[PDB]
Amino acid sequence: AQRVTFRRRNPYNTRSNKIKVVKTPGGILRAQHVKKLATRPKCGDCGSALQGISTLRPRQYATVSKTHKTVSRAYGGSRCANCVKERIIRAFLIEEQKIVKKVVKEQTE
Amino acid sequence: GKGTPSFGKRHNKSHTLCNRCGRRSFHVQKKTCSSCGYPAAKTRSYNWGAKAKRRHTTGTGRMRYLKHVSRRFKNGFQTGSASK
Amino acid sequence: GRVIRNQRKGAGSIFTSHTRLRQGAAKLRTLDYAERHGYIRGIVKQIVHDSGRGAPLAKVVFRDPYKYRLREEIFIANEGVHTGQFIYAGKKASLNVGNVLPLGSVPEGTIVSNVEEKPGDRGALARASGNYVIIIGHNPDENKTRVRLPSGAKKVISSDARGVIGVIAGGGRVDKPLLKAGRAFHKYRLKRNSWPKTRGVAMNPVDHPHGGGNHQHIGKASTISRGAVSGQKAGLIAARRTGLLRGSQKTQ
């Protein structure tokens, strides 16, 4: 079987030196250096992967349109749908409870 | 070990070229030349090292400017021209 | 005629703490106007392991009263503290586990942790896992609070010094035998180069006061005077007594 060599001067099997063995149109086997895989962006509230947001290396996000990096909702590509809904419910209920607490304080005096 | 087998492990330079003296005495990790004392302002020298002082003293180079001071003094540090 | 190991430790060349993986210094909030006069509410976001420390740390996020931003603080998590819990810190905060209170504002018998030795020092006493300080009484005139420390010592502290209600989490840790030199190795790998320990009696005389002799033996009393000098203080320094302890502790 044909054997391959690193294409860069790094001879060590480090995280940044991963290679794949591909066959070229010349009919031979050659190493191709593969970038480290991207990590899905994660919700800032619960930590789950954010649905609908592309998974790219940090600087690749500068080369894609806004549609790839956000979701049409109140917190886009920052918080997940369930965490946004929980934020809505908490905000509304706590403001209502603030109103009732204020009136209770006013009517207990 | 500690002899021929251990001499095979010598592939990391403790010293590199010194910018000031060029002697390959610049300690890589101390960032100091063991010969001329760079980057200290003064040039390293010791009175017990008389041979080293004689190796590095004035006159061991080409004295690009100092070599003409004696002639200029002999001519009185004149400033004009010979005036044919 | 050689510098001994406990003398060499003071230079801090290979004997410094391995602090790379540590979460940061565990401190109470800076004693500010909010804590001095009322209370401030923060939120426990994470309970995280700290390398080299038995007790877990709690990341508590507060609001900055003077600028619009969040201030994350690293408390030592008390047992029962959970993520999403509201922590209240100040003179007017309630007597609940995880709350930070002045020692004078708590009743006698209260169990606190991360107790300040001086007000504003952000926590000095009862910080190790499972450790705690007992409030035993207050001296409202010249305001001072008497406390019992984990060592059993009675201390008089300013009543403005703060502590966290409860016991430090991670208790019972030293009850489990390490069972392995490897487990001791991994324990001290993230604290400091203090392990393993060669016995001084197994060394040569040049290396240690206990070294030498045709049998391994100290040769002279291992109890060393407090007034001895560096290189002599090996063994039991300024020992009041020796031998197996029998009877009751807490001399008075």
Partner: protein
Amino acid sequence: AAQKSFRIKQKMAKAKKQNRPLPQWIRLRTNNTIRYNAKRRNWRRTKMNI
């Protein structure tokens, strides 16, 4: 090392340019006490030591 600093490459270039025998028209000069290149260096005999 095939990844060398410019300073090292410059010293290498100077050594390459001065790695030559004595010019043959020397040894014809009037007095010419010079017989051969006494400072000749070879990679197999004496290392440059940077």
